[model samples]
Target: SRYLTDMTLEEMSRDWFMLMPKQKVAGSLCIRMDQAIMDKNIILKANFSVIFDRLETLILLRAFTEEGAIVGEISPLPSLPGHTDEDVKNAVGVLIGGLERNDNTVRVSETLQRFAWRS
Candidate 1:
């Protein structure tokens, strides 16, 4: 939900990302990184635990990241399975990189997830 120096990442519910409208947050946010590990060949392994007062500032990371990245993760919502319309999907695409009906899942001129992080 927020962004600070040296690439901050925050956690939140999926509902906030899709159903919510424009959020406006002020004050301290963009929580500090909880974990960071630099692997061989420029890989990244990290986690964070900052929640924003409002779900507004994430876009700043989106804007600031020339690589078209920041990061987001949503785990186990109480109710499972759905969203509709380009409006919500667009935001999803922005965060996750793309969308597809099945077997679905970024840039340099621009990305992966599996057992290990990518370079």
Candidate 2:
């Protein structure tokens, strides 16, 4: 199994290609877990529910037909923010490399009801 951090974007692209398509993982977050990405990694991929109160980000890859699966917070805390907003997309292309779904759904319970914004 490769540590996600150990992968280069080039390799990560292929890894995303390595995943398997499962009905359970139709949408939301998806990635390659390992050779048995579908079997073993379901815990982290489906379970590990942890929450955050501030913003953070991720770097991920996925396949055209493959599936397996897997963000955050906000008073604008830089606990861990996203990078490569432009760089990665430009380099790998969405077919192999793409942005994090960057959702609050899979992320921890940072609850709120109404968003009052002025822009």
Candidate 3:
């Protein structure tokens, strides 16, 4: 996949036309996850039951290219959710692990959380 960091805002916008309905899904997930994070009383850890769903959504966002094609697939995307149990598990692992390394930077857990899912 291309690095978002490599693109300017104009470049990002230029390539954004292909996203469409997938962008709609991503946007909804952002709002939902952000609202959860913003609530003062919610314990984030208690929300792991829904993490699998969110992870699949994140993976879909990753899998598509700026031109709307699957990055590596030979055929159309599956009608079913393409992410496996292992994929979700590993995604959480990477997220938790990254939190360790970038915990003090702009890439810190809170910042990453916002970047990944917040509106």
Candidate 4:
């Protein structure tokens, strides 16, 4: 089965806050919003996109917003059935928590359906 990688409200909030304060992103990873919003902007820019599945209340957004590189992405994956807003928040916490650990992650394909990794 394919699992969606949708971000819950909390996750979305954290992401926006990080971007607003210009944290989470490395000094070299922070990109100017105006430039990043459009690819052809005079200033170098990043790319981003979003998709929403209304019936499921799902959202997906991707961006590669690193400074200079001007490359970033973000997206909300699908939520599991019966999973409440809080469940998703906890899930995101545990999921990201592992990613920050000092360990090696395996290289794999980019499709959200199969993009997850094990610790």
lDDT (tens digit, per residue) of candidate 2 on 57-107: 233432221123321001112233433223222222221212222111121
Candidate 3 lDDT, 46-109, residue by residue in tens: 1111342333223222222233322111111335344344433333334333223433111212
**2 against 3, candidate with superior lDDT:** 3
Off by over 4 Å in 1: 1-52, 60-89, 93-97, 105-119
What lDDT does the true structure give each of the candidates? 0.24, 0.23, 0.26, 0.27
Runs in model 3 with CA error above 4 Å?
1-81, 104-119
Better of 3 and 4 by TM-score: 4
What ranges in model 4 sit over 4 Å off?
Answer: 1-56, 61-81, 103-119
What number of clashing residue pairs does each candidate have, in the order they appear? 1, 5, 0, 20
**lDDT head-to-head 1 vs 2, winner:** 1
> How do all models score by TM-score?
0.18, 0.22, 0.23, 0.23
Candidate closer to the true structure by TM-score (higher is better), 1 or 3:
3
Choose 2 or 4, whichever is better by TM-score: 4
Residue 110 lDDT, candidate 2, scale 0-100: 13
Query: How would you encode candidate 1's per-residue C-alpha lDDT over 1-119 as one tens digit per residue?
Result: 33322233432211122222222211211221111211211112222222352222222222112222232221222232432222222333333322122112222111112211221
Q: Which candidate should be chosen as best, given TM-score against the real structure? A: 4
